[PDB]
């Protein structure tokens, strides 16, 4: 069902998606026998910095992204960093772990210097989106779609972003039909999550209200 053009777009995206730290690289670090809230916060700051570094690089390689106006490119990166981080956290969180460990993961993140006001919403999101049983390809495409969002603040040429976003949505809709052929609702389910992710922008802003040179550059703190 993917056209040849679509197959190659997907392939370039998965090549670049596959350069991130594996879920266990992240999750082994938090779950190790020796734990403190203090080192775990520093640990999370490091992981957030690497996530942004890897996202920056993902935008260099994302087909068409570097044909955009340079200022718009930076604005898309800054407008999408936090949403991208939470989506990847959902993907990571839903990967199988040894006995007791997903419970342990959640409890440590809950005792890392950040209040329950933020943490509870975020784990409900991870578990809910987890029940959709998205493939790696769906996560990758939905990430690209988040980044190429024409309605971000400060974009000068919104039509230019739209022209790259629409082909990605077309690919995603095919992937949903390929991967869950008996679930006609799937694509609409993922459209929903596009909007739900945006709620995290406010929480994170709040959370920070209560860092590394890259995070200072991209989060603007
Ligand atoms: C691994 C990448 C994709 O994600 C992270 O970096 C974040 C992960 N976050 C997760 O919840 C997360 C982290 C690790 C996991 F293994 C997981 F399943 C979920 C969220 C948050 C807000 C706790 C956090 C994130 N980083 C923070 C930095 C400072 C302060 C807070 C954070």
Residue nearest (by alpha carbon) to ligand 1 atom 9: 89
Given resolution (angstroms): 2.0
The token duo for 183 is 């679930």
Judge whether 57 and 129 are in contact, CB under 8 Å.
Answer: no
- What ranges in the chain are assigned the alpha helix state H? 4-17, 23-31, 37-61, 70-93, 101-110, 116-130, 136-147, 158-179, 186-209, 213-218
118 is in an annotated binding site: yes
The token duo for 150 is 């024409």
126 is in an annotated binding site: yes
> What's the CA-to-centroid distance between 4 and ligand 1, angstroms?
36
- Give the residue among 48, 31, 70, 14 at the shortest CA–CA distance from 214: 48
Residue nearest (by alpha carbon) to ligand 1 atom 1: 47
Coil vs helix vs strand at 54: helix
Judge whether 112 and 56 are in contact, CB under 8 Å.
Answer: no
Residues framing ligand 1 (Cβ under 6 A): 26-27, 30, 44-45, 47-48, 51, 85, 88-89, 92-93, 105, 109, 122
CA angle (140 as vertex; 112, 49 as ends), nearest 5: 35
> What's the CA-to-centroid distance between 40 and ligand 1, angstroms?
10
Judge whether 153 and 79 are in contact, CB under 8 Å.
Answer: yes
Within 10 A of 105 (CB to CB), how many other CB atoms are there? 18
Q: How was this structure determined?
A: X-ray
186 is in an annotated binding site: no
Within 10 A of 162 (CB to CB), how many other CB atoms are there? 13
Within 10 A of 190 (CB to CB), how many other CB atoms are there? 22
The token duo for 103 is 């419970």
88 is in an annotated binding site: yes
The radius of gyration of the chain from alpha carbons, rounded to an integer in Å, stands at 17
Domains in the chain, start-ordered, CATH in brackets? 1-221 (1.10.565.10)
DSSP 8-state symbol, 51: H
């Amino acid at each position: 069902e993917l056209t040849p053009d679509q197959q190659t777009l997907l392939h370039f995206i998965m090549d670049s998606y596959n350069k991130q730290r594996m879920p266990q690289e992240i999750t082994n670090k938090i779950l190790k026998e020796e734990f403190s809230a203090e080192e775990n916060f520093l640990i999370l700051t490091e992981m957030a910095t690497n996530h942004v570094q890897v996202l920056v690089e993902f935008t260099k390689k994302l087909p068409g992204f570097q044909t955009l106006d340079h200022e718009d490119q930076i604005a898309l990166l800054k407008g999408s960093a936090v949403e991208a981080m939470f989506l990847r956290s959902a993907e990571i969180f839903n990967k199988k772990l040894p006995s007791g460990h997903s419970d342990l993961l959640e409890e440590r993140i809950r005792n890392s210097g950040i209040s329950d006001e933020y943490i509870t919403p975020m784990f409900s999101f991870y578990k809910s989106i987890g029940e959709l049983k998205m493939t790696q390809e769906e996560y990758a495409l939905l990430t690209a779609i988040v980044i190429l969002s024409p309605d971000r603040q400060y974009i000068k040429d919104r039509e230019a972003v739209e022209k790259l976003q629409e082909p990605l949505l077309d690919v995603l809709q095919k992937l949903c039909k390929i991967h869950q052929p008996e679930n006609p609702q799937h694509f609409a389910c993922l459209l929903g999550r596009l909007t739900e992710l945006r709620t995290f922008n406010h929480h994170h802003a709040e959370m920070l209200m209560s860092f590394t040179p890259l995070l200072c550059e991209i989060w603007d703190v």
